[PDB]
Amino acid sequence: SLYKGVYELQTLELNMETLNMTMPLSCTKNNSHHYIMVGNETGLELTLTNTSIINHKFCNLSDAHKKNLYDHALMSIISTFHLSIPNFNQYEAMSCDFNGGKISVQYNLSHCGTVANGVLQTFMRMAWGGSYIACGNWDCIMTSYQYLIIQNTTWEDHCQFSRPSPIGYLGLLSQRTRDIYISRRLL
């Protein structure tokens, strides 16, 4: 295609996979499995599932901080995810498990304008490319899946659907602690 006679239209596509060494990269396998590659060796897995893996209502972050067995980058990423949730006020909707340096978090997404809506909005912001599978309305978005599970994992050939991209995490970095409610007077 030529414009004004002499000019010719040409394109490029940026390879957002060489940035793994310094930038978390969102990613998607299928509608019920998305991924965040923190490094070549390790990453986080975000699934939307009917079935749960944490059957209790304890997160218990303080003991995990005291033990200090978890991976710091993964903890930072899930902290960015949680603090990015707008108007999180139901603590019982979240449970966790950090035994032996593990990272596992569960958001109970069990109608318009609730905690599940905020968790889902942060989910589609984190995995921006591929989460649209799981428009017109945004103020309350709902999926048939009941639970959102965040876990640690080893990195593999996970990006089957959408290309990797750092844009979701870099966009959520600026949004931390913007819509959090007050829970204590002295804060």
Ligand X SMILES: *[C@@H]1O[C@H](CO)[C@@H](O[C@@H]2O[C@H](CO)[C@@H](O)[C@H](O)[C@H]2NC(C)=O)[C@H](O)[C@H]1NC(C)=O
Ligand Y SMILES: *[C@@H]1O[C@H](CO)[C@@H](O)[C@H](O)[C@H]1NC(C)=O
Ligand Z SMILES: *[C@@H]1O[C@H](CO[C@@H]2O[C@@H](C)[C@@H](O)[C@@H](O)[C@@H]2O)[C@@H](O[C@@H]2O[C@H](CO)[C@@H](O)[C@H](O)[C@H]2NC(C)=O)[C@H](O)[C@H]1NC(C)=O
Ligand U SMILES: *[C@@H]1O[C@H](CO)[C@@H](O[C@@H]2O[C@H](CO)[C@@H](O[C@@H]3O[C@H](CO[C@H]4O[C@H](CO)[C@@H](O)[C@H](O)[C@@H]4O)[C@@H](O)[C@H](O[C@H]4O[C@H](CO)[C@@H](O)[C@H](O)[C@@H]4O[C@H]4O[C@H](CO)[C@@H](O)[C@H](O)[C@@H]4O)[C@@H]3O)[C@H](O)[C@H]2NC(C)=O)[C@H](O)[C@H]1NC(C)=O
Ligand V SMILES: *[C@@H]1O[C@H](CO)[C@@H](O[C@@H]2O[C@H](CO)[C@@H](O[C@@H]3O[C@H](CO[C@H]4O[C@H](CO)[C@@H](O)[C@H](O)[C@@H]4O)[C@@H](O)[C@H](O[C@H]4O[C@H](CO)[C@@H](O)[C@H](O)[C@@H]4O)[C@@H]3O)[C@H](O)[C@H]2NC(C)=O)[C@H](O)[C@H]1NC(C)=O
| CB-count burial class (<10 Å; 0-12, 13-18, 19+) for 66 | exposed
DSSP string over 132-167: T------SS---S--EEEEEEEE--S--SSEEEESH
* Contact map string, positions 13 to 32, toward ligand Y, x by CB under 6 A: ----------------xx-x
63 binds, among ligand X, other proteins, ligand Z, none (CB under 5 to 8 A by kind): ligand Z
Residues from 118 through 137 that contact ligand Y (CB under 6 A)? 135
156 interacts with ligand Z by CB under 6 A: no
6 interacts with ligand U by CB under 6 A: no
Residue 182 CA to residue 5 CA, distance in Å, equals 62
* Contact map string, positions 74 to 113, toward ligand V, x by CB under 6 A: ----------------------------------------
Name the minimum Å distance from CB 3 to ligand V.
21
Q: How many chain residues touch ligand U (CB under 6 A)?
A: 5
Strands 147-154 and 42-49: antiparallel
Residue 4: C-alpha distances to residues 12, 33, 120 (Å): 21, 47, 47
Smaller CB distance to ligand Y: residue 111 or 178? Answer: 111
Instruction: Identify the residue among 102, 143, 176, 180 touching ligand X (CB under 6 A).
Output: 102
Smaller CB distance to ligand Y: residue 101 or 113? Answer: 101
Which residue stretch of 54-62, 77-85, 86-94, 146-154 sits at the interface with ligand Y (rule: CB under 6 A)? 146-154
Smaller CB distance to ligand Z: residue 60 or 154? Answer: 60
Tell me the H-state helices in 15-69.
Answer: 61-67
152 interacts with ligand X by CB under 6 A: yes
Binding-site ranges for ligand V (CB under 6 A) = 16, 129, 160-163, 165
